[PDB]
Every structure is written in structure tokens, then in C-alpha cells.
């Protein structure tokens, strides 16, 4: 381990997930300039004519394919519904991690919805949006710690136990360590 | 549901997702000024200095952070293993679609290692790197709607039973019937 200067390394220019994405939008384009868009658009009126509501990746695809027209679905949308309508279908995507599920939760709380309303919105028990909120509280190494898939969401709830100024500590044990959830409760002490 | 000109519908100017990354790259950025780097970044030598190979986040962090130095592990990777270790590090992210999964593994394979390798470095089944292999032979729409959550991965293996010139006719079956797993095996 060494200390270097940050104008002395240059960014990682392999980005596999960036590129699957371009992949998947291309060979979905190309499959639709035969049969045309999938399912609908969801859109709303916007002056002259619509703006996007729902289906960001066939909307483009679309544009690629050079298509002049795709079927859609026209609902009149608050901007606040509409905001809504984006973060729940994001909550929805089989890409979730559950830091972003637990900023999606908490955006929905801060528009006035209920965890109540947040769970029915989105199929869940109300103490599962519960539990993601408290994620929250977490230092940001610790979200990212998650995000990136070395520690577990039990990793995290124990951490949750320990007292604020003895989290990042904690963080460091389980992977210095590679400690279980079990462990990490032990940590306590 | 009607048809109209889709350059008569603008981009949606609502992108949540981008902005909780850039949200969460500022508080990270924020603590990395109060605290440093938890974790060494991992590099190797480029042109007269050297190359992230992993940490992107907490690198652009650091730079948002204002730091002149950080702490880092230099290692002499060829490109071959340090894209092998960006398809590795993506692949364990609580990130990931079982599509993007299965994407990462093709990428593997490509690079000359065995389902067996894949499994071996990932911390799963060979069965299991098999299986999400097979979702890549479904047509796009279905794959979008699996990624969309609009459908499970059950589904998706009920629709890789049915013949491809099917597929897409199933797809909107258990799309427009809203039928499950079960029903959808037919
Ligand atoms: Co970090
Ligand atoms: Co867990
Ligand atoms: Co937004
Ligand atoms: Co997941
Ligand atoms: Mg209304």
C-alpha cells in the first residue's frame, strides 16, 4: 500500500456495464425496426405534444430504430404524480440494490406518502419499508460497502446496532475479517 | 392506447435513478474529506503514471473531494486481467439484473475461461452460471420486460420452453393475461 497522487491516476476506462447497456438498447432497437415498439409508451400532454412518463429504454430504442410513430398512452399527470410514476417503477426493476430501494422509499415519504401507501405502491409489507429506510442512517462507505456487494444487508443491520461513532470501526472488522452477520452482532461489545 | 408521432413525445426529464448517484457521490465525497479512503484504490502502470482498476466511485469521490493524495495497491495486470477483474468486481455489486448477470458471464467465457472458471471466481454453481447463460437466447422485448420487473425470471424460463418463433407471442400473454409462472408454463 502507497500513497500516489490522484492527478497521477487516470479513470478506468473499462466500463462493461456501461457497455452491456449500449449492447442490450441496440439489439433492442434493432429488433423493433422489424415488428415496431413492444408494449406502450407512457406519456402525458406537454404543450405542442407529449413528454415521456414511463419506458426511458423502449423510448429510445424507438429512435433508433427510426421509427416516425410508436403506440402510446396518453394520462394527464401532475408533475408530482409523474415524479411518483418514475420512482415507482424504479423501485420495481430487477436492478434494485437495496441503498437505492431504501432513497426511492424515503423520495416517496418526502412527497407525503405514507410507508403505507409506499408498500401498497410498490407490493411490499410496510415493515419492509421500514427496515430499508433505517439503511439511511449508515455512513456512506457503509452504503457503498453494500452496494458493491461486500457486506450484506445483515452486515449493515448490525452495524445499525453499534453506536454512530463506532460504525466506520465496525465496517473496517467485518472486512478486514470477512465476518458473518453472526459475528458482526457480536461486535458489540 | 393509440398510436401517435413519436417525435411528438419528448425524453422524460425525470431521471431519479442518475440523481441518487450523484446525491450519494457527494455525501461519499463529503466523508471521504472528513475521513479518507477506507479502502486503497487499485491500480496499475499507464503511460507515465497509472490506471484505476477498481473503486471507480471512491476514486471520482476522492477528486470531488478535493484530495491531492490517496492510498492505493499498484499491481502489474495485463488488460486481459484487469478487464477480468471489472466483469468480477461488476459481478458481485447488489447492482445487477439477472440479465446483466448473465451478460457478465458471457463475457467471461469469451475471454477464454470455463463455465467452471466463471463459477469458481464468482462464488457460484457451474449450474447456476449455465442457467443465467440460457436467458440470453430470449428475444429483447422479454429481456426488457424481465429487467423492467414487468416479469420474473420464472417467466423467463417458461418462455424458453416455448419454440422462438413463440416467444414473443407468449411474452404478451403473460403481459396481457397477467398470468403467473405456473399459467405461463403452457
Ligand atoms: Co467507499
Ligand atoms: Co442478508
Ligand atoms: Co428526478
Ligand atoms: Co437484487
Ligand atoms: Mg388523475
Request: charged share 30%; aromatic share 2%.
Given at each position: 500500500?502507497?500513497?500516489?497522487?490522484?492527478?497521477?491516476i487516470?479513470?478506468?476506462?473499462?466500463?462493461?456495464?456501461?457497455?452491456?447497456?449500449?449492447?442490450?438498447?441496440?439489439?433492442?432497437?434493432?429488433?423493433?425496426?422489424?415488428?415496431?415498439?413492444?408494449?406502450?409508451?407512457?406519456?402525458?400532454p406537454?404543450?405542442?405534444?407529449?413528454?415521456?412518463?414511463?419506458?426511458?429504454?423502449?423510448?429510445?430504442?424507438?429512435?433508433?430504430?427510426?421509427?416516425?410513430?410508436?403506440?402510446?398512452?396518453?394520462?394527464?399527470?401532475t408533475?408530482?404524480?409523474?415524479?411518483?410514476?418514475?420512482?415507482?417503477?424504479?423501485?420495481?426493476?430487477?436492478?434494485?440494490?437495496?441503498?437505492?430501494?431504501?432513497?426511492?422509499?424515503?423520495?416517496?415519504?418526502?412527497?407525503?406518502?405514507?410507508?403505507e401507501?409506499?408498500?401498497?405502491?410498490?407490493?411490499?409489507?410496510?415493515?419492509?419499508?421500514?427496515?430499508?429506510?433505517?439503511?439511511?442512517?449508515?455512513?456512506?462507505?457503509?452504503?457503498?460497502?453494500?452496494?458493491?456487494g461486500?457486506?450484506?444487508?445483515?452486515?449493515?443491520?448490525?452495524?445499525?446496532?453499534?453506536?454512530?461513532?463506532?460504525?466506520?470501526?465496525?465496517?473496517k472488522?467485518?472486512?478486514?475479517?470477512?465476518?458473518?452477520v453472526?459475528?458482526?452482532?457480536?461486535?458489540?461489545?
Open positions: 500500500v502507497v500513497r500516489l497522487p490522484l492527478a497521477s487516470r479513470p478506468n476506462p473499462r466500463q462493461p456495464r456501461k457497455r452491456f447497456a449500449e449492447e442490450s438498447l441496440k439489439e433492442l432497437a434493432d429488433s423493433i425496426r422489424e415488428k415496431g415498439l413492444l408494449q406502450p409508451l407512457l406519456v402525458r406537454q404543450g405542442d405534444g407529449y413528454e415521456l412518463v414511463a419506458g426511458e429504454r423502449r423510448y429510445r430504442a424507438a429512435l433508433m430504430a427510426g421509427l416516425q410513430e410508436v403506440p402510446a398512452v396518453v394520462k394527464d399527470l408533475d408530482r404524480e409523474a415524479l411518483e410514476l418514475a420512482l415507482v417503477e424504479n423501485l420495481q426493476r430487477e436492478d434494485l440494490s437495496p441503498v437505492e430501494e431504501a432513497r426511492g422509499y424515503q423520495a416517496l415519504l418526502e412527497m407525503g406518502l405514507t410507508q401507501e409506499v408498500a401498497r405502491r410498490v407490493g411490499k409489507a410496510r415493515s419492509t419499508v421500514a427496515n430499508a429506510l433505517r439503511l439511511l442512517q449508515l455512513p456512506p462507505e457503509a452504503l457503498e460497502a453494500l452496494e458493491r461486500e457486506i450484506t444487508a445483515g452486515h449493515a443491520r448490525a452495524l445499525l446496532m453499534l453506536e454512530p461513532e463506532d460504525r466506520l470501526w465496525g465496517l472488522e467485518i472486512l478486514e475479517k470477512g465476518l458473518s453472526r459475528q458482526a452482532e457480536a461486535l458489540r461489545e
